Design a protein around this ligand. Structure first.
Ligand SMILES: Nc1ncnc2c1ncn2[C@@H]1O[C@H](COP(=O)(O)OP(=O)(O)O)[C@@H](O)[C@H]1O
Ligand SMILES: Nc1ncnc2c1ncn2[C@@H]1O[C@H](COP(=O)(O)OP(=O)(O)O)[C@@H](O)[C@H]1O
Ligand SMILES: [Ca+2]
Ligand SMILES: [Ca+2]
Ligand SMILES: [Ca+2]
Ligand SMILES: [Mg+2]
Ligand SMILES: [Mg+2]
Lengths: 82, 375, 160, 126, 74, 375, 82
């Protein structure tokens, strides 16, 4: 009976410690999950902005190249006209 | 707008359907003319999968479709699909019922009669328009330039035709229609890309090759010098990113694809290039209007948008033509929609308002009315 | 359960003291009258079941108005009765769609403030402008004065 | 406050909407009956001879054919509208499907049965 | 032959909603009853026309709703 | 609930049978699929000793049984035992007679026909269900994620298969089924544990090795660095208490057991790992849907629950794939029951309600009805 | 002694259950923490990409303006020569 009482006491101590550790871990899980959701939303917005910018830049480059080639041809024709 | 009644200027084309109300500057809705049934099985239930995606919707789901153009070379080979395309154009891209709007289709020169008659029969029976009129695709492109003379080379995607006109009097004996166009250039580019290792076979990958052709290819001013330069340096190799990565590098395939226009022997065609069929079309005309046609050569159609074609063609014709005449090539920046802009201008005219084929006239003479006075 | 909550709420608030006595009969040792993760887990393990903490947090957050993560005494009753789910399929989709189509008196595809005001004045039930404002906040999510059909479905989620 | 009064107000609004819809539908049905009764020219089946009866029957059969043609045109228009609205619903499904699917609620395991088992009859909720 | 089917179906409506009608070999009572049948057919056709008008209005409203939903979802 | 009729979403699997009524969040009863006859003699009289303990009962008396799984690799090798398992599942774990409930079994891709036909024949003759339907285990896992595209890698316990799907159209020519799964990892772990002295041989001790694998093993982000670290320090050695004491210490066996997934040469298999069969399955698809499949890679099945696999797989695919594409790996926390959740969703749909194989249809065409339109 | 030993057994069972809860919570916590750090790095990368794309867009716009001016000059020269 004495040994059983000792075991009961140590079990109670261990149970209390484990429960407190578990509750702390659950609270940390909740907070980190919220943080992850926020940062993921921010990353998605940044990605969509970058994609739009890249598309517009590519289109503008194409337009610039076209008009530049046109100007070069026109200048060559002007020299021939001279 | 309001009361009154506006005309629908549709333009079937072959490759891009361009439509819009008469009196504007640009077509309202431009979308590829492809109808693609799905080809795989499909396991998700209730996904709302349709049996045929037409127009621009089938250029986004093209990974699991088998796109097939309903217009081969000007002529229409699959009437059910063409009817589907027209129905989509009227109801979803413009959202105007055809019961309250005249229509102005366009047709290539020298096309089979049955095609035109079936077109008018469809427009009058199925869609039930008030009145429709069919016009030759080159006269409109001449309208858009604001000229009244000139010889117009309308190199579309289906067929390239070259109609000379003087003082408003078309010369029916000098029309030179050639069946090389953008589609054959796409096929030839897809065939010469295999020389580097890139194999495109599926009908969906033809669209990717078309995009490569549009964005990279250009017409060389002098062919042999470019062939020699591209074989020594590497200043021409431009790269391009496929729809999944794995960038590709196009070497001297850049100016060899559109060179087929000036040497149709590349794809095995016998005839002469677009640089010599224009000169032949001019020489069939009378001796006193050749100077005006030389000075007012007009370019139109999509395929004439290659960077550097308005100089190569002028150089070639100047080589062929007599040294005294001045050769000028009109290449407006709005080349692609030139036919449709001309169509809008023609439909907006007051003098033209009594040339429509009214429905009661069709009821009295049948579909063969189109060949009659109402041309 | 929620309908059972409405039926039970028609009685006295000393029934809340009786509920506390029953909760003691369950897990005697309670000290605050609020149900956290630990007490719910303990009672469910006594019963022989175990819902996840994430599910409990979602259930709590859906009713959380003050944003403190807790519940008041009436809110304690609300959270206690929210432990079962009996509002299934949300009445009917087609009938509610027909009702909303009839609501749009000008047939513009949206529900404006004037239409809702007219309908509320025609209802005849004792209402206040504060409840009208709360309903407008709950219904028109993006504050454009108009209800989308999808917004109509969201505003009618879990409604019998 | 809580959502009990909000749900009561929402149910009251739904009841008022249903009653107004029922009354409006009944009124429209009555008006439709009156209009249909007024449209058709009444029959005059007294004092008409045999030849007159045959002539009137032939005329009315011609009229019936014309009305059949009109109703066929109306039905064809209705069929085209049905096809268009079905295609619009298809596009709605395409643009509004994907991750916009509602889900049921079976994740919660039985709770009242455990309450009855560990409480005898002390649980009267369920 | 969808167009041919349409024309043949219109002809079949003409020859079916109005069968091969020989009102010359019927007695006075039969003629009166057939005239009343034709009148009741007119009534039924008008009723179905009004029903189709109601359906057309409902379809227009639902099409507008779908258009608004499409525009907002984009 | 009440009137009406609910469907039974059973999911045979191989290792854990998961079942429950349609429309819930989690399976009602999950229990190992093992049937173990006793092997010793038995001297107590009247103890009520049965001849075969199935399900979770044989995981408690496993000390004197010889457990044997009735499903080897997706396919079913012992039909009597499988019938016993189904009978237990229906009558004791759910307590609903099958005479009043439709059933929705699940089957791996590319399985023998005879297995599926025998399954439907059993369900219709022995249990006498009203209607049953067989679905591919990957489409359901795609349902549960709420997607409609994506390539799903469903690494179960019997067989790992990789079904790519786009816009609801499955690609039957790109399914890559590999027979390495959790069971082979258990055997390999049991084989490498012998390098420290621990010998597990009995079919009952395979369960203990499975528990060790579940609780301790993890997938290394980089294999060589972990092998070097575990050979110098001792920060990895985690201990575990057997069912009788005598704790054991697992060293670098922790990340070597699940590494077999990415290097199947460890257990002598020729094929490439799960990191390269996904890339091969993608590359067989068309060139225009590869970006979407890259961005929507889905993980499912039990064996994909190793801590740290969603990063190793992403690193490997990013190494293989072109640098421009974005690689994203969807790893929901409810991975294990993903197939069953998807099955519940599919069975709860109204559009799906007419796809069941009704009993009268089976009576008219025999068991070969399953390969027909009702797939 | 017997009653206290039964109580000790129950305490031990509850203790080991709480231990399992704590271990699972710790696993979730560390996993989500690693996810957070990875997502943070991804966000930084995306922002850098967007900045580069914006710079490219600006430079292309300026070059296009220059080429348009050159084109106007060239067309004037061409008509004068004509
Ligand atoms: N910017 C471009 N550069 C080169 N080729 C082009 C360009 N745009 C269109 N094309 C070619 O022209 C075709 C479209 O021609 P289009 O004028 O639309 O034909 P249609 O006369 O039938 O309308 C496309 O198939 C494409 O191959
Ligand atoms: N938490 C876990 N960690 C590691 N491996 C696991 C875990 N849970 C299950 N497994 C492995 O997955 C297998 C169960 O896979 P499961 O998805 O049930 O297969 P099935 O597809 O037949 O249902 C088990 O045999 C085990 O080896
Ligand atoms: Ca609160
Ligand atoms: Ca309104
Ligand atoms: Ca709104
Ligand atoms: Mg054209
Ligand atoms: Mg499985």
């Amino acid at each position: 009976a004495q040994k059983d009482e000792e075991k009961m006491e140590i079990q109670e101590i261990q149970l209390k410690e484990a429960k407190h550790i578990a509750e702390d871990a659950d609270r940390k899980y909740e907070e980190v999950a919220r943080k992850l959701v926020i940062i993921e939303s921010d990353l998605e917005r940044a990605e969509e902005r970058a994609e739009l910018s890249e598309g517009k830049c590519a289109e503008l480059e194409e337009e610039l190249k076209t008009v530049t080639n046109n100007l070069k041809s026109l200048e060559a024709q002007a020299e021939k006209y001279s | 707008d309001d009361e009154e009644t506006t005309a629908l200027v549709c333009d079937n084309g072959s490759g891009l359907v361009k439509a819009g109300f008469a009196g504007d500057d640009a077509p309202r809705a431009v979308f590829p003319s492809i109808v693609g049934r799905p080809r795989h099985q499909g396991v998700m239930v209730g996904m709302g999968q349709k049996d045929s995606y037409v127009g621009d919707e089938a250029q986004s789901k093209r990974g699991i479709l088998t796109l097939k153009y309903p217009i081969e070379h000007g002529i229409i080979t699959n009437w059910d699909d063409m009817e589907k395309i027209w129905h989509h154009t009227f109801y979803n891209e413009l959202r105007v019922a055809p019961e309250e709007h005249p229509t102005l289709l366009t047709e290539a020169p020298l096309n089979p009669k049955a095609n035109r008659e079936k077109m008018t029969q469809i427009m009058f029976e199925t869609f039930n328009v008030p009145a429709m009129y069919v016009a030759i695709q080159a006269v409109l492109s001449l309208y858009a330039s604001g000229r009244t003379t000139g010889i117009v080379l309308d190199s579309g995607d289906g067929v390239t035709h070259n109609v000379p006109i003087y003082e408003g009097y078309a010369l029916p004996h000098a029309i030179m229609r050639l069946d090389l166009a953008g589609r054959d250039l796409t096929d030839y580019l897809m065939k010469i890309l295999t020389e580097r290792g890139y194999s495109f076979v599926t009908t969906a990958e033809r669209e990717i090759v078309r995009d490569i052709k549009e964005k990279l290819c250009y017409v060389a001013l002098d062919f042999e010098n470019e062939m020699a330069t591209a074989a020594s340096s590497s200043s021409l190799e431009k790269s391009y990113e496929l729809p999944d990565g794995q960038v590709i590098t196009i070497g001297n395939e850049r100016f060899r694809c559109p060179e087929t226009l000036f040497q149709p022997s590349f794809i095995g065609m016998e005839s002469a290039g677009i640089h010599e069929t224009t000169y032949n079309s001019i020489m069939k005309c009378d001796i006193d209007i050749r100077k005006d046609l030389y000075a007012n050569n007009v370019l139109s159609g999509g395929t004439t948008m290659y960077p550097g074609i308005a100089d190569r063609m002028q150089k070639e014709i100047t080589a062929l033509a007599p040294s005294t005449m001045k050769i000028k090539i009109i290449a407006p920046p709005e080349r692609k929609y030139s036919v449709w802009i001309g169509g809008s201008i023609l439909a907006s005219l007051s003098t033209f308002q009594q040339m429509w084929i009214s429905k009661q006239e069709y009821d009295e003479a049948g579909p063969s009315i189109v060949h009659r006075k109402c041309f | 359960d929620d309908i059972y909550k409405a039926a039970v709420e028609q009685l006295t608030e000393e029934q809340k003291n009786e509920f506390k006595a029953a909760f003691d009969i369950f897990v005697l040792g309670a000290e605050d009258g609020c149900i956290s993760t630990k007490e719910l887990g303990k009672v469910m393990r006594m019963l022989g079941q175990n819902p996840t903490p994430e599910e409990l947090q979602e259930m709590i957050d859906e009713v959380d108005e003050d944003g403190s993560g807790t519940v008041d005494f009436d809110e304690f009753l609300v959270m206690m009765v929210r432990c079962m789910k009996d509002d299934s399929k949300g009445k009917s989709e087609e009938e509610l769609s027909d009702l909303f189509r009839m609501f749009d008196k000008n047939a513009d595809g949206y529900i404006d403030l004037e239409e809702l005001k007219i309908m509320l004045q025609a209802t005849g039930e004792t209402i206040t402008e504060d409840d009208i404002e709360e309903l407008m906040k709950d219904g028109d999510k993006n504050n454009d004065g108009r209800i989308d059909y999808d917004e109509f479905l969201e505003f009618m989620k879990g409604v019998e | 406050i809580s959502a009990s009064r909000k749900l009561q107000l929402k149910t009251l609004m739904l009841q008022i909407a249903k009653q107004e819809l029922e009354r409006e539908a009944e009124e429209r049905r009555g008006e439709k009956g009156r209009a249909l009764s007024t449209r058709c020219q009444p029959l005059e089946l007294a004092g008409l001879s045999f030849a007159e009866l045959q002539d009137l029957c032939r005329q009315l059969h011609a009229r019936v054919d014309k009305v059949d043609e009109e109703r066929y045109d109306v039905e064809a228009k209705v069929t085209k509208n049905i096809t268009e609205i079905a295609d619009l619903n298809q596009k709605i499904f395409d643009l509004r499907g994907k991750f916009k699917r509602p889900t049921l609620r079976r994740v919660r395991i039985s709770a009242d049965a455990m309450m009855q088992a560990l409480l005898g009859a002390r649980a009267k909720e369920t | 032959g969808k167009r041919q089917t349409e024309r043949e179906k219109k002809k079949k409506i003409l020859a079916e909603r109005r069968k091969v009608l020989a009102i010359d070999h019927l007695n006075e009572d039969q003629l009166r009853e057939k005239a009343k049948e034709l009148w009741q057919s007119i009534y039924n056709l008008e009723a179905e026309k009004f029903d189709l008008q109601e359906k057309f209005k409902q379809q227009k409203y639902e099409i507008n709703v779908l258009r608004n939903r499409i525009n907002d979802n984009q």
